[PDB]
Design a protein around this ligand. Sequence first.
Ligand SMILES: CC(=O)OCC[N+](C)(C)C
Ligand SMILES: CC(=O)OCC[N+](C)(C)C
Ligand SMILES: CC(=O)OCC[N+](C)(C)C
Ligand SMILES: CC(=O)OCC[N+](C)(C)C
Ligand SMILES: CC(=O)OCC[N+](C)(C)C
Ligand SMILES: CC(=O)OCC[N+](C)(C)C
Ligand SMILES: CC(=O)OCC[N+](C)(C)C
Ligand SMILES: CC(=O)OCC[N+](C)(C)C
Ligand SMILES: CC(=O)OCC[N+](C)(C)C
Ligand SMILES: CC(=O)OCC[N+](C)(C)C
Ligand SMILES: [Cl-]
Ligand SMILES: [Cl-]
Ligand SMILES: [Cl-]
Ligand SMILES: [Cl-]
Ligand SMILES: [Cl-]
Lengths: 207, 207, 207, 207, 207
Amino acid sequence: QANLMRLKSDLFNRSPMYPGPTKDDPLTVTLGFTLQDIVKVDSSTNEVDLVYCEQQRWKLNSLMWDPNEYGNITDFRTSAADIWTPDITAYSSTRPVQVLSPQIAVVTHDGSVMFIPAQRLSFMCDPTGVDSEEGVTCAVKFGSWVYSGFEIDLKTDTDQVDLSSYYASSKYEILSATQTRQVQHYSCCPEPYIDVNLVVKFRERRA
Amino acid sequence: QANLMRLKSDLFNRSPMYPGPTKDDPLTVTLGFTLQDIVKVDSSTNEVDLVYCEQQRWKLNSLMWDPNEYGNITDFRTSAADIWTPDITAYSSTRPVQVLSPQIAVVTHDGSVMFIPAQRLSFMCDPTGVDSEEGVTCAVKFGSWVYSGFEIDLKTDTDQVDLSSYYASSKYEILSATQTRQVQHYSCCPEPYIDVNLVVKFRERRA
Amino acid sequence: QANLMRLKSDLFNRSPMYPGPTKDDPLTVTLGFTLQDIVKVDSSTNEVDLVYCEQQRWKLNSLMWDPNEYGNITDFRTSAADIWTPDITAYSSTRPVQVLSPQIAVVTHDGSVMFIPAQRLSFMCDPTGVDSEEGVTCAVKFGSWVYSGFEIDLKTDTDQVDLSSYYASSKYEILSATQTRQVQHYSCCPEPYIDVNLVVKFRERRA
Amino acid sequence: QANLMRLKSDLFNRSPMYPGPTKDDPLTVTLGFTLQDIVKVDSSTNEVDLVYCEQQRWKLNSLMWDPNEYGNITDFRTSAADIWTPDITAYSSTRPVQVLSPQIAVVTHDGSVMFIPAQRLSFMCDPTGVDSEEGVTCAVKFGSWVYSGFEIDLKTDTDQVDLSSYYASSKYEILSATQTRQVQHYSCCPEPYIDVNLVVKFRERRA
Amino acid sequence: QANLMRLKSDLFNRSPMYPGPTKDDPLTVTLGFTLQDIVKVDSSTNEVDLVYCEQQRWKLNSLMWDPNEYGNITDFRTSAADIWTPDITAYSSTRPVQVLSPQIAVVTHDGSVMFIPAQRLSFMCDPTGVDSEEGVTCAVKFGSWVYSGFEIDLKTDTDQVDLSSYYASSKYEILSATQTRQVQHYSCCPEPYIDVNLVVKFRERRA
Ligand SMILES: CC(=O)OCC[N+](C)(C)C
Ligand SMILES: CC(=O)OCC[N+](C)(C)C
Ligand SMILES: CC(=O)OCC[N+](C)(C)C
Ligand SMILES: CC(=O)OCC[N+](C)(C)C
Ligand SMILES: CC(=O)OCC[N+](C)(C)C
Ligand SMILES: CC(=O)OCC[N+](C)(C)C
Ligand SMILES: CC(=O)OCC[N+](C)(C)C
Ligand SMILES: CC(=O)OCC[N+](C)(C)C
Ligand SMILES: CC(=O)OCC[N+](C)(C)C
Ligand SMILES: CC(=O)OCC[N+](C)(C)C
Ligand SMILES: [Cl-]
Ligand SMILES: [Cl-]
Ligand SMILES: [Cl-]
Ligand SMILES: [Cl-]
Ligand SMILES: [Cl-]
């Protein structure tokens, strides 16, 4: 307990709160979605509700340590409010995202962080054709709200969304689920922003 | 990281928290709207729900710095709770506005600040005629709640709302969307308050 | 900025937080309702939802200053969390009141404060007869929850509720709207509590 | 203002925050109910919503003072967050209780406290027979969640609920409303826990 | 009060906040479920709502004391925000869990802690067959979100869920309710995570 208490104290005191990435000190966040359920489809407003886990990984030099200096501690768990986190946002939500899991991250001696928030998202989607054989396709972009491609870059380990935890008895069955990196420009800003586009084809499951 | 940490420290210590504008030190906020979706229309209460982005720009001498003094840093991202922000409010909302994006602003070396919150608004609007060819027209005023024209002035870059991000498969199609600056008087107060009037003409989209 | 920064600093440091009124140091709050809309009527639970602005005015010796001592500053805007505010409560609400406007007050050199919160209230009201020619009458009392008449007194500038901002295309039209001061006794307490009774007669508006 | 400011300062500084009652230092809380309205009855989930006021009273030696030492101040109003309050909980709620009134208590020089929160409760209740002549009976227990009889005891002044403020035009009329002290044992714990059982018989009101 | 005030002061000052368990300092949490009610079943989204109490027990060397050193105090009640608590989470919730009881734990001189939060959970469950004689079976896993089996182990005193407080007049009757310990692997992580699987068989109750 003493060693971890010391490590946590030293990582916090060694330097003030990390000010986020810069053009000169950029960061690459690895995103990966685990789609658990398509809960609701609303045809009167064209909103669809998803339950998923957004897996996030990044590395920070400021969170690095030598295990030999801190009782061979290789990693630890900490509140996500105690460390810097990326501002990964759904670009087309219709409601504030609901967080379903504790806000705790895992920090490793190499400075790498893993943070997996489970969330419920309500986003823009016309479900017309959900009841058909072909089903309906809907997409939502995820990325930083304020950091461009020069400050925050995004990466995926695979183009395939994890469906190994998708609720079998859900009202909707998944025909396809894709997560692909893309670089866009916006009216507000001159720099190119980067995002992970979550595209999911689904239909009503027969009882 | 060191340079930005220093800049942020020096900008905060240079003077206590900015007390907002005054008659003697007025401010001009540039407002612009990017209408993403008309989510819901409720004819039983006469409420309409919009999803949009509110681009806000202002300039503060207190936030100015020389990039040559801080490792050629030209701008930075910071929590909107760490800086003064204008109190732009919808004058005719029926629910507390829901914030859909992170509360982070961008501050530039000339002292200018850009903050683009994404929000969901539920406001007063009779939708009667939404299903007709002509559609229905509804308006909502945005402006400071406590600062008059002598303290906060508002400006737009264009009278035409940004519709380049409007959800194509929305239940409602946009016939027209306008943003106009106007100056009004109220019973409470002797000074003229200024606002940006968002007027949007819309109808039900055919499948 | 310097003068206002100084005034605000001196007003906070000159004395600890104001402990509220007392029998020995009583206060008079001026109440005034601007009814903007009757949003919803629910006949299955007998609840009615209103959108209104509650103008509150009071004077405090502790908030007084000499403009000649602070660069001819006659007034300033401040967060309502930074100053004492009265606990004006609806005595018959069915839901926690939703605040629709920023929590900012205007303080003047004579120690007077003006605070205008915009709110949505869900209160006890049987709407039977709303569809009739005569319409329905419903009332809700507003007053301090813990302070009696000896500590907080209430006053109105007119017995007429401001209807100049009432939404024209509302589902309900106003036949009459009154705000009267009244003094009552309760089982709990020996002292007389005072309230402002909001009485509004309304009916369904024809297209 | 000076005397009250001083009293409140001295009451806070004389000793650290009160750690709650103990077997050695027990406390007796007096509960009372003022049932204002039976808002909703839901037969599809078996939930019933009440709007009531809970009068709570207890005495603490730590909150005692001599009025002659503090400008003949006999009592004062304070935020309920500034003092210890009991964990009186509804044992069978289906939703987190909504607080409708400000969280302010009244403290007297003898150390006695009075706190009357107005709340909306959604609790377990099968309404089958609400439309009959006999009506339906439903009950909800109120007690401390963590303190047993040896630490917190409960008392009522009357066994009759206060119905003098019950909304006349409510959808439901009260046939009977009782508040009775009872002592129970639970599977978790060996000590006897004490509660106040709120039993109310009601039916649908005829127009 | 003095002795407890001292004990609480000494337990807080003797060492900084406990950093949670480690591979080298693991912890075993005992889980128990008291199912109070199956509130709602939604066949249009496949969500089911439960009201239950989750009894949690763990022991910490850092919370140990000698009663003879602190006026024969054997235990005390404290805010759960003042002590470390495990991040026991429902792995398949569709909404953020609603807490229905005060967040207070009971700490004993041997360092053991008992914490019983009453909660409302909305989780993934197809209710098809709830109206049949056989009823429907639904399951939800509870475990730590970030700690593996090497850091947090789980244990149950019985496989049988406590039904002695189940609301008799609920819309749904319980046919069976089980709580069994299980060890799983996940896509994210290499270490085995452990959970308590809550399996409940229920059907619609006949009036
Ligand atoms: C800044 C602007 O015009 O809009 C950005 C929001 N987005 C990502 C959906 C198009
Ligand atoms: C720069 C800024 O604040 O945000 C706009 C949203 N975005 C990222 C897609 C263009
Ligand atoms: C000063 C104040 O609270 O304002 C009330 C109405 N308004 C918003 C137009 C000026
Ligand atoms: C006189 C006063 O309180 O202002 C209300 C103006 N309004 C409704 C548009 C906010
Ligand atoms: C004195 C106190 O706690 O409040 C009781 C309810 N009241 C005063 C509004 C009628
Ligand atoms: C304790 C007491 O008598 O209060 C009732 C609260 N009231 C009448 C506002 C609804
Ligand atoms: C351990 C436990 O919660 O037992 C029963 C409490 N009760 C009846 C409120 C549900
Ligand atoms: C002891 C504890 O934390 O919780 C038990 C619930 N109760 C109040 C009925 C006995
Ligand atoms: C490991 C972690 O950080 O959280 C992921 C969800 N879990 C634990 C059930 C696999
Ligand atoms: C990232 C990963 O594989 O974790 C899933 C956790 N679970 C099954 C609760 C949904
Ligand atoms: Cl301000
Ligand atoms: Cl940041
Ligand atoms: Cl107060
Ligand atoms: Cl306590
Ligand atoms: Cl932790």
